[PDB]
Structure 1
Amino acid sequence: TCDLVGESEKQLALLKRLTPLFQKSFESTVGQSPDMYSYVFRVCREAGQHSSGAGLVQIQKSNGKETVVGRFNETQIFQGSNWIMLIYKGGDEYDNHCGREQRRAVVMISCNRHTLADNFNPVSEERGMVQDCFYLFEMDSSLACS
């Protein structure tokens, strides 16, 4: 399961508030041909098929190259008025961008009082996230409501 970065029982409780999503699998594909990437995200569970401990991976559809965007063994989580921010650090280092630092995944879970979990997608396409050196994603969930 998710391992908190650092004990903030506040974040611990939050991981528990999110367990109803652990077994679900979210995917979103952005961009057009030659050039199309598929993002697979999971909550405190393996997201890739060639990785270990990946929380969110990027898959180049042209050749299936799977890049780890963030790991759930380095999780951070915060709760706003009607959203929950989930962060997965320790992803693969950029090859020739953003100072070759480790990739990081940020998922903004917005309160949606009519779905337990739905509409996951990057806040991009893949020709903008790398430019901004920020993998920002979003999804809906009543779990993010308060």
Structure 2
Amino acid sequence: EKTCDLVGSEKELALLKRLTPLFQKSFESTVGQSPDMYSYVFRVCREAGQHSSGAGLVQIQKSNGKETVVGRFNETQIFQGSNWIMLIYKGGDEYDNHCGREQRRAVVMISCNRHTLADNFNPVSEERGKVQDCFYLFEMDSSLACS
């Protein structure tokens, strides 16, 4: 029953409670093309990795099957916007390349969409092989982000 732990905020806890219906869902997306193909696994307040490292979102590199923690849910921040919700997981694995040695962080932009409870999970910004944004941004739709 390990859920999100808010970095620190109760206004914030209300937002997490609103996202409860998504806790059991799993979200995944594969990017790139052989050889350098990667796969992202995202979950709301639940483990997304296979190394029980408390990861809220992971990047799996398809050459070695290596898992990189983008962010952990025990360091969660969440904000309500005009037609969206921004979920953030901090404390991921350190970049130890050109991006510096800072720990990765995961940002998921949940747009309001009354037609679906949750869908269309897709990466927008990443630090993946050739793509060097030194920033991880994902998007998805949810009727939960409405109002």
Q: TM-score, normalised by structure 2?
A: 0.93
Retained in 2: the 8 A contact 1:129–1:136?
Answer: no
CA distance 1:141–1:129, change in 2 (3 Å): farther
Cα deviation, residue 61, structure 1? 1.3
In structure 2, what is the Cα distance between the partners aligned to 1:64 and 1:124? Answer: 21
Retained in 2: the 8 A contact 1:112–1:145?
Answer: yes
* C-alpha distance after superposition, 1:62-114 (max 9, x if no partner): 21100000000000000111100000000000121311110000000000110
Report the more deviating stretch, 46-55 or 72-81.
46-55
CA distance 1:46–1:127, change in 2 (3 Å): closer
In structure 2, what is the Cα distance between the partners aligned to 1:59 and 1:67? Answer: 6
CA distance 1:76–1:27, change in 2 (3 Å): same
In structure 2, what is the Cα distance between the partners aligned to 1:56 and 1:130? Answer: 18
CA distance 1:81–1:58, change in 2 (3 Å): same
In structure 2, what is the Cα distance between the partners aligned to 1:123 and 1:41? Answer: 14
* C-alpha distance after superposition, 1:15-59 (max 9, x if no partner): 000010000000000111111100000000000002421000000
CA distance 1:9–1:77, change in 2 (3 Å): same
Retained in 1: the 8 A contact 2:126–2:134?
Answer: no
Retained in 2: the 8 A contact 1:30–1:125?
Answer: no
Bigger strand share: 2
Instruction: State the partner residue of 2:102.
Output: 101
Q: TM-score, normalised by structure 1?
A: 0.94
Any idea what SS the aligned residue of 1:11 has?
Answer: helix
Retained in 1: the 8 A contact 2:127–2:133?
Answer: no
Retained in 1: the 8 A contact 2:126–2:132?
Answer: no
Report the more deviating stretch, 119-128 or 55-64.
119-128
1:3 paired with 2:17, answer no
Any idea what SS the aligned residue of 1:29 has?
Answer: strand
Matched-pair identity in %: 99
Bigger helix share: 1
Retained in 2: the 8 A contact 1:88–1:104?
Answer: yes
Structure 1 stretches lacking a partner, 5+ long = none
